[PDB]
Amino acid sequence: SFPLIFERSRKGRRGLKLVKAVPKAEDLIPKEHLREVPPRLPEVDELTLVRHYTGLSRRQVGVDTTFYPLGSCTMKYNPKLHEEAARLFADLHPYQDPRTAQGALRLMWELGEYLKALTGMDAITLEPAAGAHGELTGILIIRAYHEDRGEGRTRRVVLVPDSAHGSNPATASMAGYQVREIPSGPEGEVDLEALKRELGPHVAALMLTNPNTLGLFERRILEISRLCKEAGVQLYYDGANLNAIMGWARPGDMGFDVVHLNLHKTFTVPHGGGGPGSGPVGVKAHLAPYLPVPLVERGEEGFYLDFDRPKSIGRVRSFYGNFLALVRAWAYIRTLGLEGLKKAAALAVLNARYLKELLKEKGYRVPYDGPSMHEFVAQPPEGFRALDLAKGLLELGFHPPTVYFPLIVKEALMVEPTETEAKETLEAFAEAMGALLKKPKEWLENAPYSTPVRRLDELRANKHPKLTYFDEG
Amino acid sequence: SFPLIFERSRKGRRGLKLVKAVPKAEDLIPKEHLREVPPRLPEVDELTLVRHYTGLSRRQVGVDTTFYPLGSCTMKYNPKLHEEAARLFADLHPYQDPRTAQGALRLMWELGEYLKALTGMDAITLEPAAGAHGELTGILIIRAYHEDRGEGRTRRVVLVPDSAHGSNPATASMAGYQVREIPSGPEGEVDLEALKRELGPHVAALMLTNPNTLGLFERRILEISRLCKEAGVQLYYDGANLNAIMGWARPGDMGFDVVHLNLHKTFTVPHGGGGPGSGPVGVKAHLAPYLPVPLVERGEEGFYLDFDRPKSIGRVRSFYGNFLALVRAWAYIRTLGLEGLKKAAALAVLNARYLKELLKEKGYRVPYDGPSMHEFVAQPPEGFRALDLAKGLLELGFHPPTVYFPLIVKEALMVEPTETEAKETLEAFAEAMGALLKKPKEWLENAPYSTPVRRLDELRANKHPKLTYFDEG
Amino acid sequence: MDYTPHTEEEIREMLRRVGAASLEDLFAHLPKEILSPPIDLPEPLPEWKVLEELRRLAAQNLPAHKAFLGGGVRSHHVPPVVQALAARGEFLTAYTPYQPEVSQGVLQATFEYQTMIAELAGLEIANASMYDGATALAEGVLLALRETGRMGVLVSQGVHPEYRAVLRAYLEAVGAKLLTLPLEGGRTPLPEVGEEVGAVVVQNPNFLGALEDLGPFAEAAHGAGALFVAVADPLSLGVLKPPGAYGADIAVGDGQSLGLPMGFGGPHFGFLATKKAFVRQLPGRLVSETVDVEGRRGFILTLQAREQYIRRAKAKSNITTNAQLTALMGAMYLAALGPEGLREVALKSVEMAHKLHALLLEVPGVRPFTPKPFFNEFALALPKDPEAVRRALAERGFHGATPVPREYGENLALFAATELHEEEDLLALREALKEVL
Amino acid sequence: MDYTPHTEEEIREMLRRVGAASLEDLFAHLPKEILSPPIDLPEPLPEWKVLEELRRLAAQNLPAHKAFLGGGVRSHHVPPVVQALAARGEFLTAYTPYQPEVSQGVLQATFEYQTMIAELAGLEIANASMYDGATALAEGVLLALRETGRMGVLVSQGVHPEYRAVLRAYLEAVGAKLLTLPLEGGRTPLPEVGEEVGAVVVQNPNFLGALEDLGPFAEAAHGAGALFVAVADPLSLGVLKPPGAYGADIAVGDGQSLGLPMGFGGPHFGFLATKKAFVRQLPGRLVSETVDVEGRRGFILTLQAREQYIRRAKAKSNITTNAQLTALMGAMYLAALGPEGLREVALKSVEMAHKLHALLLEVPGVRPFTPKPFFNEFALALPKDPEAVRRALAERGFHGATPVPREYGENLALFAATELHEEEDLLALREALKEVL
């Protein structure tokens, strides 16, 4: 059991006291503008605050405490070094004179250069706040491109594979595009025939991850690029799976026109329980003019924010991007270097293939198992549902991988161990996976048991939702 | 179960890599001086290190997570603000040019003045590393004082109350003195009659806490001082219980000649699982010439470390004191000021006196219950063992108070809530103490049950001690 | 240097087990033409060196602590207690809470955050967070348009220009239409709302720091069947009547003012509060209280049909990763201060801003612009170009004079003050400004 | 400001419950003459203002990061990963682990610390920590005198002068006798040890940085029935043969060199290692592995008859609070680097020290003093007063030239180099020194 911060409150109790002499409200603000009924915020002392949040953290797990083999999430170690790096730039105002923020602007420029070098892009924006935001940015960029070509009314469809992340099609709608889903081949890769059947002057772009969500590299990516090019279709790169090929291959060299990256995935920016993140967007020269403003450019006087771009799609969020996250990513790249990143990608892939071998040995199945990259998708043997096994792992002290995604594999177990996890950890995980298969159905269907809370009434939460402590409305 | 860091090790595995180009030992150190067999230190990667210690912290409790009513420990809230305060002075070298460390020296001088203000002392050293270290420092000062007056051969005994903390008599020994314990009276205060029978030219000093370890103020302290002074006996103040009276009364005005303070108790310096701490020692002018060196003084140049003290007892530890702990205490005092410290002392006393009433209503006895100050000593009703109630508390999610101390009370429950604990917390604790008296004998004796580990085998640890992972020798 | 644990012997065994001849062999199936790309990156550096380089970059900047710059971000006190708690490894490194049984820490914290935001806005519900204030506004408006089924939008020019720019991008993408209502005398005049308008947007305090009377705007909107979206700084809600009390349907804003480090613009978080009756159109994650099999209170993500995993193309938004950690920092700030604590901080920044305005009125050639009453920010007409003034101020070691775009008027500059400013700081800034002018 | 949670209504109720009329009435039983003392303290300040003042104080100092100062404390890299782990509230705010069931985190961490220190020292056991190196030495010598039942001590002048001063203070207190062995050519000549000697003390590397040949010292001590006590910097033990390897009975030292912030002298921690055979005389806390009621592995404080609570007047030492947290930081560092990582750090520091030694020797008038072989510190004979040189160097932005007391010789100054020093740093120092001289 654990109390809510609101239950810990006590009428009139004070916490932080940041003001010595409090002014009278009516001497500063006209009455009709003053709040009459105070907001019902907690009223607790600092000790209570500390115990509350420290207590909550103890009812929580993270990479720092547990192996998180979440496919499509790259739950790699988040170096403490980076938190120290970030605090070094905490006191900077986005509107302060740029001549006094050259250190910050330089870091942004350099990061942009490193990311372009790793993706093979010609220009880049570090502004988008997350991968999905990068998606919207790139799709709007592609849209501005077509409209600038007089094909604005004909290019109305966006193609995405059946194994795409939900954000892809959701983005098309946000961009005002219609979306068509192309089926994957028998090997889990793009079905060229189905693709050539969908390609036409009505297609604005094709969104792909490479490796794809099955952890497989699209071996015919160059052909796919060729087909898209002749049809005038822009090839969008969902860079969520970049961890698998960092330093070994670049999307730009594959023919991709626009790409987005997830610093909070591939580049160690902490997941923070959902966010925040950073979704830089790189593009080939022909799409550069449509990039959102501002861009960080290097001039002879120094670094500066460039707003002079007539064909820009405009702004996608305030200021210039999640700078502190950018600091983290810069530190990561400057620590590892090219050789460090390559070794990271190789070991991320090695851990994935190794763990795949261990699970198949335990009885797990892999419907699409060509050479696995940074991740793979397994299925439990017939009779077991991913859901229950996930709950069983929770009971055993492990965290389950991603489940029920991609959508093209029933009882999908999307496993991504990343490169920072050790061999013995992969083996311990595989052992737990194997042991759960020897557990009676009922034990599995009622797990977890020892966790701070057991399975929750999801029906109630959806039928009679209580969204706040005061549940108003 | 939780693995030892040594069990997490893997041969050849690396963690931090702080050296780019590693030189060859042979080129810098002669072979005969080179270590042949590497120390068996753990070999773990950084993610493993993080999971190890994060995991260990989760198998631990502290003021940040739990109410710690430890008598004689003052487990008050340690403001996070202070950790940021200390970080600001991390990169200072004790031997750097003092002209470049005026900020650190000013802080030291100021804290010394504040502590002298609160204690009524004339000169002070911030050098001692902890309360007990301060005790030795103070007793050595008293010895230097007597020797300087030519009574070093005759002044050979140190008097301490039967309720004194073990460090007191232990200190007398480290200082070459004999120790004689004096019995307390029927109300738990000093027995003036037994004191007079002990006072004489053979007595070097009398060591007392005030309030005493029963949490009772020594109402006849002025007469005690008169008697000591009359016999030439120096009055030493064990300041561990200063939290009870800071801002309200000063040991200097009570007649004490020397005092030591515990910054890690009274002034919020974190307990750190045992240490480190800080034990400043203040003295009246007549004893000032024997203070250890160096002392922080302010000259016309600026602040400086003064080593010119011909009668100094010398040095009791390296450098000048636990500076970072001093920074924290300075921050504390500058935040609260006199009114804040007085309020703190009053509410620490109110919390103790209030909680005492709650406990007595649950059936707990208080053998010496005059007006309670910052703590009180209770004993369970007949038939119950403090030890068992303590373990029972653990099972209930609480932490027990200090047990089996002071030594003059059987099954002693030495409770000190401090001022930072809330009314409702005191009441929940009392409710738990009450509920435990209703639990069956077998339940209490076999508690705890849900903690990471249940009662440990102390006999085994003492009969067959395993002091290291390697258990060599 | 790197973070992989693998020893050479472990790599050999693993390669052998997966049938790979070497690490490079793991990539042998990729088209030969894309292998061995010419990537140029600086040589790896040990952690202490990486830190040295960071400090060198930081040493190049002039810290903005106690800056008088405004425009949506201000130098407020960042409480160490809040940062200490948010630095706990469990909060910092956890992923989105999809396995509730082991994520109650984050789940409950988010539920508490939702409650505090709702209360602050005077509304009923709020999502788990948006990227920032600007995107929150865009999502809030799109929500209003889906709810009313209309495509027209009226937005006061008093709304931060960057917010309006982001709003336009999201709007035109979906084919909606936006009309801007120019400010008059620093405030926005009550517009006539047509039945084609689905949302009316106004910010309070507005971009120039002016307090706006939201009441009539909400009525005007409702009179036409349109929803009223209010953009409001969260800290100001500690003392100003919240949009909820004015009849607002949706409230959005950026959380930087809730003790968050400025971080040169990011990251921070955005909040979106509305009526429970509009929950169906609400984008982002939402936490609900529930119970487990044994009857224990629990929290869990709910109504996920509004999100991308389940709804994909028809999801209310494509938002996946949000701004959870920073949103939690905001919640911790609100909890640490409480209702009266927040009110004091807000009032104090207003007091100092007003004192600064009074002092600045004595500077030769300086004229007031933002009309009274204003909050903790205000704009002045300067006798020299604002960008030129900010630069000169910087040369003297002061951060002030946030240039206001000409669409609002000529030579305008914003000035702000917070609870960490004292009289002596205001005087020092004024002398610096007099020297510059 | 303050941290008490009490509201006025709660105070009122509590006072009624304890029968007090007011807060001051709680002290009414105290003698009237000591009440209302005249205490002068500055007025209270909010946390942001307290921080502002701290900032102002720190701004007055010239940071010592990358300093070339030596003498027991050096500027080594403080790994953020260690500081992040040691910042966890559970480690930071716990008290001595007397209730083991809920203190297994600190208990096990301490057991691991004891293990790492013993290993590093080449010995069998170690206590939970001493205050610092100096007092660890004092306690270590006293252990040897108690164990041997003798009162004589021989200490090399090569032992840090402050360590010897502290040793003398502790020794004379119990009536022990101390004889100092003067350094010859920078090293300690082998002494003749009488049967009245219970302890022979030598430091390696010594105060001047010279490596000492410990073997014969141990043998000379054992031949007379005395015990050999070695003072050794922990980091050096990563590459140098440990005192335990030479036959040392006791090893002590300061843990600052294990990634701990210099903090202007404290706090750090001291370690005390010895033979399991001498455990009965060991002062301080000692953790032992054991098992719980069901057979689960656990850790607990043991052999407490050596401590003050149980033994009081006859305790081995009066030590209570120790240096647990910083000792744990030391353990974390040792764990983070491992045997090879620690060896590399030690080697790099030696390499840079030697590189620096050669460079400074090129400055006209500069002559060597510490003979080869030396470690990561060395003393030079300068043409100018060391204190004067230290100041001139500081005025130029460099921290170096630690003045060496005349008991060692005239115009001597110590220099040190660490793993965070690069060629460019050494050259910059030489150029500055060239200027001052």
Ligand SMILES: *Cc1c(COP(=O)(O)O)cnc(C)c1O
């Ligand atoms: C994580 C993910 C995204 C979305 O990125 P966010 O940063 O979460 O918005 C998109 N596509 C794939 C394949 C992903 O795994």
Ligand SMILES: *Cc1c(COP(=O)(O)O)cnc(C)c1O
């Ligand atoms: C805590 C305590 C001490 C010793 O202080 P340390 O800082 O632990 O050395 C001495 N006397 C009393 C009464 C104490 O409570």
